[PDB]
Amino acid sequence: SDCRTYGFNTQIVHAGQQPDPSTGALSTPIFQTSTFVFDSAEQGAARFGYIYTRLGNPTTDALEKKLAVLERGEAGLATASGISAITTTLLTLCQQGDHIVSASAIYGCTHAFLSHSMPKFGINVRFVDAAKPEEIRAAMRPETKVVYIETPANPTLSLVDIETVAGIAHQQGALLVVDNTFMSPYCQQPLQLGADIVVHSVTKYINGHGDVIGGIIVGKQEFIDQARFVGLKDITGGCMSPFNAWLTLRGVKTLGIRMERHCENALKIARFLEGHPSITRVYYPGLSSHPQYELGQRQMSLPGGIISFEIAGGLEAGRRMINSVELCLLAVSLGDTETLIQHPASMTHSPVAPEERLKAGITDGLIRLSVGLEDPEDIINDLEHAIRKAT
Amino acid sequence: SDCRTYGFNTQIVHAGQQPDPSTGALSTPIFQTSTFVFDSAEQGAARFGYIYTRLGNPTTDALEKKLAVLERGEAGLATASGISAITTTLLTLCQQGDHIVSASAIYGCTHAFLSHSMPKFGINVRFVDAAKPEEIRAAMRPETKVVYIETPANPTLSLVDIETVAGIAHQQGALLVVDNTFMSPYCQQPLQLGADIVVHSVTKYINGHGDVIGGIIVGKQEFIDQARFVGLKDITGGCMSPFNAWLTLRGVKTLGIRMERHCENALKIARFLEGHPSITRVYYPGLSSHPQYELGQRQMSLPGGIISFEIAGGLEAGRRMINSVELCLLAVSLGDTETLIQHPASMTHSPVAPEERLKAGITDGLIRLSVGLEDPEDIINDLEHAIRKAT
Amino acid sequence: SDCRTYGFNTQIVHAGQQPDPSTGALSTPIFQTSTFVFDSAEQGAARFGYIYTRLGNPTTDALEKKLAVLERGEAGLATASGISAITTTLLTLCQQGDHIVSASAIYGCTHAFLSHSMPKFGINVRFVDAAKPEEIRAAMRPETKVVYIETPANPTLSLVDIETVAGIAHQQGALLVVDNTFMSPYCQQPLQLGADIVVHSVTKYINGHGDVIGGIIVGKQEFIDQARFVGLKDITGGCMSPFNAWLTLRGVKTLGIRMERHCENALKIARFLEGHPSITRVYYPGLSSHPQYELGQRQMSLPGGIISFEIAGGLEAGRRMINSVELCLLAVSLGDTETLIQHPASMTHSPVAPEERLKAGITDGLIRLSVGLEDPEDIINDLEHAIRKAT
Amino acid sequence: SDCRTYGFNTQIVHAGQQPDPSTGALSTPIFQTSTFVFDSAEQGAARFGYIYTRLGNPTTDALEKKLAVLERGEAGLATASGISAITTTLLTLCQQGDHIVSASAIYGCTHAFLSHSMPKFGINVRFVDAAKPEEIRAAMRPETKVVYIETPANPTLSLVDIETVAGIAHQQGALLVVDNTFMSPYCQQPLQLGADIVVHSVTKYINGHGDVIGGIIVGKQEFIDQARFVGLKDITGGCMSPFNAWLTLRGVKTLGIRMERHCENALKIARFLEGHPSITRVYYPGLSSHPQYELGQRQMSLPGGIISFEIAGGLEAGRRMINSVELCLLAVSLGDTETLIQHPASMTHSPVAPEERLKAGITDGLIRLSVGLEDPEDIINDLEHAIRKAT
Ligand SMILES: [Cl-]
Ligand SMILES: [Cl-]
């Protein structure tokens, strides 16, 4: 039949994949090759099938097709990293003199590319509060090629109204690019809401197993062809290795059941934190006091596996808390099967001036939690123990 | 001791590698992880050791250190592809308004990046015949940041005098970047001749096994740090996967013995071709009639594993010949353990106007051969059979 | 702390694993090595730590420890295959003159080893209906070393009362070995019910991703040491490769959520089949008409992901049905993320005399289904379509 | 054509391998699957192509075919380990009441299987000095099924005359099994000299990269079919993982050039040692004073990469020497790209009574060296330094 016709869990398992025609092997083979051979001079010219992995590969093709199906896009393009997904996309679309309107609340490394790299190539970027679609509209210029957003966004899990922003971008002649890393296609589908291009770090939930760095771009065939044959081939060279593609295919098999459990666990933990008198604030789209709660309910099928919260006692309390957990692991990644915790003020933004962190929504007591697949009772006990100690 | 002190074969085997301290495992472990954990808040801030694979990884570090030792450079940086090695380097070094002087005889995909991508970012490129160092000098401008060369260069294996070009570049305040892919560090060491930065596609000889796409950059620590923390992190995102790094480490173990055999085989095959009346020309640095033979003898320890030659009878003869080989495989890669053959006029440049191919040194009868590790007698027999048939 | 103290899902994620001490890498490194190096002559003799992978390996050790925790056993031993787990166990325990009492309803390849291989080594085997514990007792001899059972058992998913059989075996001085492949430790824990040794094919649910052949043995340290240093080292040589161990560790991360979904899906499908007038019988421990339903409820936490059923119309109907499915895949494995279906009478037991199949509970219309992670509605629709066509 | 017709180096590269028909991928794909799917009920029964990896796999098939070609045998069978190659072979061939005549000078773990395991299965073994073919003849009985030999043999690299022993075994109705691990097919071809079955630990030279544990069996199709469908399937379960097969295929690509360099290096080192006044004896088939030198010249194309030697000063000198090397690595494996050294009296046989070691040819001063691919000058310097210190 056509994989586009099955239910979402069925698609997660099957889309883009089939038994190997030649051998019947059920697992997608790992085509760990650089070289592809032609049967003749004619068959070589015809393709100029496969030719060379940095242009294409059967293992990676399966991943690209699967993710395109899951995001309801025409085509996918795998990359060496989430960063490469973003930069391959933007460097394909933009040239000197062009302009981008970007959310301010975005991944830190994206922010560096946008604030420092792009302008050195003559591409200017305006940063705005994308929670306020009017700020996006006001920042648009005749030269604006792209509006770029992330939702939910760190560090307080604020949201962006994708459909509304898409309409604004399109009326003003720009494309909307959405980083859907935090949600995965299981929880949010930006293309269905009017986005033109979706990017992911598959490093997070899509792979889910904390053992692959990689990215994916999904969009129209016409664009993806340019991202592949110009962006990857002629700019970033950010190809994904076939082994990484195979691991990601393997990881994504369980995307549905993983996201369900991540989100079930996260909701329980969020409610625990909201009831804890030593915790001043809890940021989680699943809590009704979230400023954009109703938007979240329309736009997201589940509230996600990530929680941020503020512990009483500022910087020292935050440090003491992360130093006091015994089960949660101290790390800066997210979307793994293990629960990960970090305290940005002391771990990643320690050198940054306290007042500058504050402006960026990073308070001294802010803790970010990536909820894993453990028993939530064990995670809650670990948190309760650490919070008691830290306060 | 210090690996920098052992003989070159010893370095090939050992440099950058040692038994795992914790377990004694001799093979470098495959650190197929995205996430690294900290023991405390303090240990997390201290590093901001390892943190996240796209910034660094112990497996990839071993490869980088080994290649730095082999090229006699301070530091190495692994990438997702040869292309990414080149673009990460150049996009790190250059910004809008800057200028590059490049050889015309370079890898095709490099040429696209330089001719189309760079100018769209405001970076201008002059192409010159780098076999004539005076053309390099004449093309330099106050804005020139980089001179970029490849040697030997396709498709006729012409050479570039690295030491002479380095002196010219430096006197005029530019860096010299050399693509050393064709030679490998076993056969040529551009840094020892004054180059500032060496790049490779490890996809070719360094890996040697036709199953990895990847690149490497070697140079001063100061530059490599920028290529890593800005180029990779903030521009291309072109990180190498740890599995690919491990395979490359494994492949490079045999670099010395592979290059010796490739070159022994190639010399035999080149001499056979030079004696064949149906072959009009043979391009191989190991043949004394090579226009830059003596330069090759000073600059290269071995003449390489690649040969180009022209078969009598033009386009149709070239097509018939590649369609008539039975052992050599039709492919566009090089540096594999298998002998690979291609006929650019019919396979890769078929759409290109015949007169434009001619200007680029690609004649209708030109065949390129990547000589593998087979018995040279079998390769010669295959070639002899195919040539007889084609003519 | 101690991983033995956390909840079962937490153990699934964490047991046997921790961040790499030296690097902080969260993923268990792949120690793909054969060789381990010593720091001195003394450190070499001391171990005679690690020495050589076929004796031990840090990656494989993590898997062994995890599975020991999950089965509530002292120690684990990984093997090249489920078969090797069984034969390494039995060949370690038994010698010429010894006797084994085995269930008749066991894995086919086990049956070959027991019926043909063992007797040629002077080890005699009695086969009994293990659904009747009295038959086990009656078959025991002074020479009986082992009682061997599988539960649930193919092809009608009959059960064996582990606790009762354990008591009988022990009173008569024998060990009880249980193949727990069908259930996984998530659904059944034979050691907790008195079994001495548990074996698995990890090829099925423990890995769960259809890309690893492997086995595991769990039991007392004293026995496992013998299985390792004599059974593996001196009899079967059936070591697991570190890469396979790593993939299995990765697969087992999702064991809990996978089993929950497999069993939720299977129950739905079983109830659908039980309501279908073209289906004469449905064998599933989750259906109350199962002959040993109550035993199943005490012994198993979930009824499993495997269903067998009989379609009206015998051999031709069974053939037509499996030839008519479009989503379910025709294969003989089980426990994969994809739904797999087979018709033993036409696929695996076709050469076997119809009357002999009947005696073994394999009727002409019997179909076996391994329910995957797809939407159960899609699987049901596929089954409904195929059944309608087949009848 | 037919790979059996090309030169040996060509066969090393190409035999058993070809570009993937479906995709053109040059590297043999890694078919990391457990499950194979059928297109129909009929196609399923027909095979009962591939079915299940423990029975067969396309990646492993390529390795088996290649090694069969290299040993000039009909068929190959890959296994989980060298030990499993040996035991799968012998347990397939022998049953209770049968007898084996074995060399005494064999791999230690083989000796355990033969001396302890076999007799417990009713299979008796006589050990003889296989350097004396008359001892083999004298030990043969009506029940003798197999004569088993290893050549060269540890720990003094004594030889066995394969052709002569084959003739004796055959006249008395037995098969000859030869462990060809030390030589590899590049240096010795026992089947060409009359052996019936060859086994290897591919862990050593065939893989050559110190990162795979595995074995191979090569022999007649009729026997290999039994070793596969009974030995592996019904006795040891010792299947090789497809990833290990792929790594071994990759490693064996360089077998020819590796063996040439190992042996060139070893001869140089052996001659150095023979000239050293602190070294009482040097055991190396390449030295003319080897007791069976001429036999070695007829039977072996190269003298190998392994050397044993005795250092003056017995146990303490041996310990001091291995504790004094700085480049050579202390390990018990062999055939790796790194030079490995061990002192059996202090490292592996330390608990063994000194007088018992002596009987087995293991003197207190005996050192075993596996010569790697380093510059031999560096290895010699390291040895010279250590010997001076130790004495
Ligand atoms: Cl290799
Ligand atoms: Cl997985």
Cα four-point dihedral sign B219, B224, B227, B232: positive
Across the interface, do B29 and C34 touch by the CB < 8 Å criterion? Answer: no
Residue B114 DSSP one-character state: I
* Cα angle value A6/A12/A17 (rounded, 5°): 85
C-alpha distances in Å from residue C238, one per residue of C85, D79, D82, D292: 8, 8, 10, 36
Residues 6+ apart with CB under 8 A from A212: A202, A203, A244, A247, A248, A251, B32, B34, B241
CA–CA distance, C17 with C14 (Å, rounded to integer):
5
B297 and B179 belong to one structural domain: no
In chain B, residues 227-286 whose CB comes closer than 8 Å to chain A:
230, 233-241, 243-244, 247
- Indicate whether D245 and D360 sit together in one domain: no
Is residue A329 helix, strand or coil?
A: strand
A243 CB neighbours in chain B (<8 A) are 241, 243-244
Q: How many angstroms separate the CA of residue C243 from the nearest CA in chain B?
A: 10
CB contact under 8 A, B27 and C35: yes
Spatial separation of the C-alpha atoms in residues C39 and D330, rounded to whole Å: 7
| Alpha-carbon gap, residue B197 to A283, rounded angstroms | 47
**Nearest Cα to Cα of residue D248 among D366, D120, D91, D78:** D78
Distance CA B263, CA D103 (A): 44
Chain C residues with beta carbon closer than 8 angstroms to that of B24: 36-39, 49-50
Render A91-155 in DSSP notation, one character per residue: HHH--TT-EEEEESSS-HHHHHIIIIIHHHTT-EEEEE-TTSHHHHHHH--TTEEEEEEESSBTT
Interchain contact, C26 vs B19, CB within 8 Å:
no
CATH number of the domain that residue A103 is part of: 3.40.640.10
In terms of domains, do A118 and A142 share one?
Answer: yes
The candidate with the shortest Cα–Cα distance to B207, out of D59, A35, A228, is A35
Could you tell me if residue C227 is inside a domain?
yes
Q: After which residues is chain A broken (C to N over 2.5 A)?
A: 48
Structure-block tokens of residue C388? 């309608």
Q: What is each CA distance from A362 to A102, A149, A346, A352, in whole angstroms? A: 19, 19, 11, 10
Q: In whole angstroms, give the CA distance from residue C114 to residue A164.
A: 68
Residue in B23, B38, B39 nearest the CB of C36 = B23
Q: Which residues pair with B177 in a beta bridge?
A: B148, B197
Nearest to A34 among B48, B83, B333 (CB): B333
In angstroms, the first-to-last Cα distance of chain D is 59
CB contact under 8 A, B58 and C25: yes
Nearest residue on chain A to B332, alpha-carbon basis: A35
Distances from the Cα of B151 to the Cαs of B99, B161, B190, in angstroms?
Answer: 21, 8, 10
Mapped onto helix, strand or coil, the DSSP state of residue A79 is strand
From chain A, pick out residues whose CB is under 8 angstroms from the CB of B234: 83, 109, 112-113, 116-117
Beta strands in chain B (DSSP E): 75-79, 99-103, 124-128, 144-150, 175-179, 197-201, 215-219, 279-283, 306-311, 329-330, 340-342, 366-370
Note whether A256 contacts C329, CB cutoff 8 Å. no
Q: Which is catalytic among the residues D204, D261, D320, D357? A: D204
Q: For residues D131 and D155, state if they share a domain.
A: yes
Residue C1 falls inside a structural domain:
no
Query: Which ligand has an atom closest to residue D211 CA?
Result: 1
Distance between CA atoms of residues D304 and D323, nearest Å = 25
Report how far residue B180's alpha carbon sits from residue B183's, in angstroms, rounded to the nearest whole number. Answer: 6
Look up residue A331 and give its two tokens: 């790390």
Instruction: Provide the CA D300 distance to its chain's centre, in angstroms.
Output: 14
Give dist(CA B237, CA D62) in Å, integer: 36
Domain for residue D1, yes or no? no
Whether B109 contacts B243, CB under 8 Å:
no
Domain end, chosen from D238, D255, D272, is at D255
Q: In degrees, to the nearest 5, what angle opens at C-alpha A44 toward C-alphas A41 and A47?
A: 150
In the block, which residue shows the tokens 């089960």? A327
Task: Say yes or no: A261 and A251 in one domain.
Answer: no
Does the annotation count B378 as an active-site position? no
Are A241 and A262 in a shared domain?
A: no
Q: What is the 3-state secondary structure (H, E, C) of chain D?
A: CCHHHCCHHHHHHHCCCCCCCCCCECCCCECCCCEECECCHHHHHHHCCCCECCCCCHHHHHHHHHHHHHHCCCEEEEECCHHHHHHHHHHHHCCCCCEEEEECCCCHHHHHHHHHHHHHCCCEEEEECCCCHHHHHHHCCCCEEEEEEECCECCCCECCCHHHHHHHHHHCCCEEEEECCCCCCCCCCHHHHCCCEEEEECCCCCCCCCCCCCEEEEECHHHHHHHHHHHHHHHHCCCCCHHHHHHHHHHHCCHHHHHHHHHHHHHHHHHHHHCCCCEEEEECCCCCCCCCHHHHHHHCCCCCCEEEEEECCHHHHHHHHHCCCCCCEECCCCCCCCCEEECHHHHCCCCCCHHHHHHCCCCCCEEEEECCCCCHHHHHHHHHHHHHHHC
Chain A (13-32) residues lying within 8 Å, Cβ to Cβ, of chain B? 32
Is the CB of residue A209 less than 8 Å from the CB of residue A336?
yes
**Experiment used for this model:** X-ray
* Phi, then psi, of A148 in degrees rounded to 5: -120, 125
Question: DSSP string spanning B124-181?
Answer: EEEEE-TTSHHHHHHH--TTEEEEEEESSBTTTTB---HHHHHHHHHHTT-EEEEE-T
Residues B238 and B376 in one domain: no
CB count within 10 Å of CB D275 equals: 9
CA C32 to chain B, closest CA, distance in angstroms equals 6
What does the alpha-carbon distance between residue D238 and residue C83 come to, in Å, rounded to a whole number?
8
Cβ separation of A9 and C338 shorter than 8 Å? no
Within-domain flag for A157:
yes
Task: Spot the catalytic one: A179, A196, A336, A382.
Answer: A179
CB contact under 8 A, D37 and A19: yes
Q: How many angstroms separate the alpha carbon of residue D129 from the centre of ligand 2?
A: 52
Choice among A204, A228, A258, A368 that is catalytic: A204
Q: Please state at what angle helix A376-390 crosses helix A314-322, rounded to 10 degrees.
A: 140
Q: Contact D338/B27, CB-based, under 8 Å?
A: no
* C-beta separation of C261 from C373 below 8 A: yes
Place of tokens 């006729």: B156
CATH code, domain carrying B292: 3.90.1150.10
Give the catalytic positions of C in this structure: 54, 107, 179, 204
- From the list D54, D65, D220, D281, the catalytic residue is D54
Number of domains in chain D: 2
Range of the domain at D301: 256-388
User: Cβ separation of D25 and A50 shorter than 8 Å?
Assistant: yes
C53 touches D81 (CB < 8 A): no
Q: Is D50 one of the catalytic residues?
A: no
Kindly tell me the burial class for residue D318, based on how many C-beta atoms sit within 10 Å of its own C-beta (0-12, 13-18, 19 or more).
buried
Mutate to test the interface with D, among C47, C145, C201, C241 (most CBs of D within 10 A): C241
Interface of D with C in 47-106 (CB under 8 A): 48, 51-54, 79-88, 95-96
Q: CA gyration radius for chain D? A: 21
In whole angstroms, give the CA distance from residue C69 to residue C321: 42
Size of interface A-B (CB pairs under 8 A): 238
Answer yes or no: do C250 and C297 share one domain. Answer: no
Active site residue D107: yes
With the CA atoms of D327, D328, D330 and D336 taken in that order, what torsion angle do they form, in degrees rounded to the nearest 10?
120
CB contacts of C83 in chain D (<8 Å) are 54, 233-234, 237
A275 in the same domain as A368: yes
D194, D76 contact by CB (below 8 A): no
Determine, yes or no, domain membership for A1: no
User: Measured between alpha carbons, how far is residue A223 from residues A77, A88, A176, A230 in Å?
Assistant: 10, 11, 13, 10
CA–centroid distance, A12 to ligand 2, in Å, is: 13
Domain end (from A255, A286, A302): A255
Burial of D40 per CB tally in 10 Å (0-12, 13-18, 19+): middle
* Contact (Cβ atoms closer than 8 angstroms) between residue A103 and residue A153: yes
Q: At what resolution in Å was this solved? A: 1.4
What is Dmax (Cα atoms) for chain A? 74
Q: What are phi and psi of C263, to 5 degrees?
A: -75, -35
Beta bridge partners, C281, equal: C310
Asked whether A162 and A195 are in contact (CB, 8 A), the reply is yes
Cα–Cα distance measured from residue C223 to residue A2, given in angstroms and rounded to the nearest whole number: 52
- Is B246 within 8 Å of C32 when comparing Cβ atoms? yes
Q: Name the one residue in this structure whose structure tokens are 């002629």.
A: A234
Domain shared by B225 and B195, yes or no: yes
B247 C-alpha to ligand 1 centroid (Å): 7
B116 and B170 part of one domain? yes
**Separation of alpha carbons D101 and D133, rounded Å:** 11
Q: Is residue C245 part of a domain?
A: yes
Q: Please report residues of C whose CB lies closer than 8 A to that of A7.
A: 374-375, 377-378
d(CA D44, CA B226): 58
- Identity at D92, one-letter amino acid code: T
Half-sphere exposure of C228 (CA within 13 A, CB side): 24
- Residue A268 is inside which H or E element, if any? helix A255-274
D151 near C CB under 8 A: no
DSSP 8-class letter at A240:
P
- Check CB contact under 8 Å for C237 and D323: no
Contact D235 C87 (CB under 8 A): yes
B238 and B117 in a single domain? The answer is yes
In chain C, which residue's Cα lies nearest the Cα of D343?
C41
Taking CA–CA distances from B56, the nearest residue in chain A reads A213
Does C234 sit within 8 Å of D52, measured CB to CB? Answer: no
| Burial classification of residue A203, based on how many CB atoms lie within 10 Å of its CB (0-12 exposed, 13-18 middle, 19 or more buried) | buried
Task: Please tell me which residue of chain D has the smallest CA distance to B258.
Answer: D257
Task: Name which of A235, A352, A364 to mutate to probe chain B: the one with the most chain B Cβ atoms within 10 A of its Cβ.
Answer: A235
Facing B7 at nearest CB: one of D13, D336, D377: D377
In this complex, do D373 and B254 lie within 8 Å of one another by their Cβ atoms? yes
Three-state SS string over chain C comes to: CCHHHCCHHHHHHHCCCCCCCCCCECCCCECCCCEECECCHHHHHHHCCCCECCCCCHHHHHHHHHHHHHHCCCEEEEECCHHHHHHHHHHHHCCCCCEEEEECCCCHHHHHHHHHHHHHCCCEEEEECCCCHHHHHHHCCCCEEEEEEECCECCCCECCCHHHHHHHHHHCCCEEEEECCCCCCCCCCHHHHCCCEEEEECCCCCCCCCCCCCEEEEECHHHHHHHHHHHHHHHHCCCCCHHHHHHHHHHHCCHHHHHHHHHHHHHHHHHHHHCCCCEEEEECCCCCCCCCHHHHHHHCCCCCCEEEEEECCHHHHHHHHHCCCCCCEECCCCCCCCCEEECHHHHCCCCCCHHHHHHCCCCCCEEEEECCCCCHHHHHHHHHHHHHHHC
Under a CB-based contact definition with an 8 Å cutoff, are residues A214 and A248 in contact?
Answer: yes
Gap between the Cα atoms of C249 and C216, Å rounded: 12
Residue B1 belongs to some domain of the structure: no
Task: Identify whether B173 is part of a domain.
Answer: yes
Residue A240 Cα, gap to closest chain C Cα (Å): 20
**CA of B210 relative to ligand 1 center, distance in Å:** 10
Provide the β-strand partners of residue D176: D147
How many angstroms separate the CA of residue C210 from the nearest CA in chain B? Answer: 20
- Whole-number Å distance, alpha carbon C250 to ligand 2 midpoint, is 5
* A 331-390 near D (Cβ less than 8 A): none
Backbone angles phi, psi at A367, to 5 degrees: -120, 140
According to DSSP, residue A16 is labeled: T
Give bridge partners of residue B279 from the DSSP assignment: B311
Of the three residues C193, C224, C255, the one that is the final residue of a domain is C255
**CA-closest candidate to residue B188, choices B285, B114, B254:** B285
Q: d(Cα A12, Cα A186) in Å, to the nearest integer?
A: 9
Facing residue for A239 by CB, picked from B80, B86, B210: B80
